[PDB]
Subunit: 116 residues, 4 copies
């Protein structure tokens, strides 16, 4: 599991459950190509997006559908989604944990990168 | 000044100065059309991006070049840039301030929407 | 204005208005002596807490009553308050802005220190 | 484990390791009494601070020694420490995860509260 995403709700002090996200990888022609997708579990985590073999060097974008999340709670949020764009595996394979903390008008995102 | 952006540096505790950014507006074919751009001032602020006549309802993306900012400081950053994507919605009388707080491996952004 | 505090509301995307806070200065017996206090304005800012003659080096604590703020909005908060504890250090010419961004179960604070 | 604290470093994109913290509980005379203490592990986590029996209703303060952390990395930070003060177990036993994200001039803290 070289890529895991964890989403928290700062309003309810809970994991953010059933949050959809799409991962994209930049192709040689500079377009974003679909790479993987999924929804967070009860712990607010999404595991198993990719494998070490498949997760090659490149520029990746994680689009977290924060807007649908807030909507289903009755909240009309500011952002369309939270975006995280980064170069991966530039110096060799790493494990990446992307954490996102959500409020209706704010979000923060951090990465934990560890050497396999 | 319907839209202003403020950027802060969490490593040095200062405004983030000379940060470049581009603002895009979502087009009907779902591509991003450039709309406005600039560099943050000494106060870390970017003013005069648009006018209220021009700033109509729609989806907007602010793309902040955080990577070049950290490179200039000699610090290896995680993100390619920081993106803030939002819908502008008439309410009516409203001004938008988008604040970003930057660290090498983290960023946070908030909107202050007033009248 | 050597020290100013700004508070923002991440749930409503606005300044946090009428937030009460107290500033303490660490005494030699390691207890906190009240120093200054006030309520945030309509811009979510608290100015005029101290003067530069009075604002000498030392350890300071700003205690922001976030709990009363969320109670007034009908939202059950996690924190009793938000505390920012820092050392003021001559550098020399410096102004301090302490910003806090509040959510019911989270807060973030940053210092912008300029000249 | 009704109380766990997790500390992350936003400058290095890593867990914040060997970070000291002290926990205090407000006594009936309004003073802060020592409750528990420890240092974060290699995963940036501190487990086993307390037990369900011992962790009664009350107002608790977690003082995270962020200043020593930054110092040992050669950084002169803004804050003396990060403080988290909260009422616990007011409606019955809960499990609390306190997360703290650190930069030299900034920190954020969030709580995840789950019903046992
Ligand atoms: C409009 C002025 O914004 C500030 O001075 C600070 C904003 C801010 C945004 C996010 C944060 O986490 C924070 O601590 C502060
Ligand atoms: C138990 C939560 O584990 C985490 O990775 C929390 C990360 C985190 C992300 C953003 C924040 O503002 C924060 O305080 C914490
Ligand atoms: Ca995993
Ligand atoms: Ca545990």
């Amino acid at each position: 599991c070289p890529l895991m995403v964890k989403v928290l709700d700062a309003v309810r002090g809970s994991p953010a459950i059933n949050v959809a996200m799409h991962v994209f990888r930049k192709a040689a022609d500079d377009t974003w190509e679909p790479f993987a997708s999924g929804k967070t579990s009860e712990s607010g985590e999404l595991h198993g997006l990719t494998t070490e073999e498949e997760f090659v060097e490149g520029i990746y974008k994680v689009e977290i559908d924060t807007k649908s999340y807030w909507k289903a709670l009755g909240i009309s949020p500011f952002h369309e989604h939270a975006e995280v764009v980064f170069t991966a595996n530039d110096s060799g394979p790493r494990r990446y944990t992307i954490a996102a903390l959500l409020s209706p008008y704010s979000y923060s995102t951090t990465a934990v990168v560890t050497n396999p």
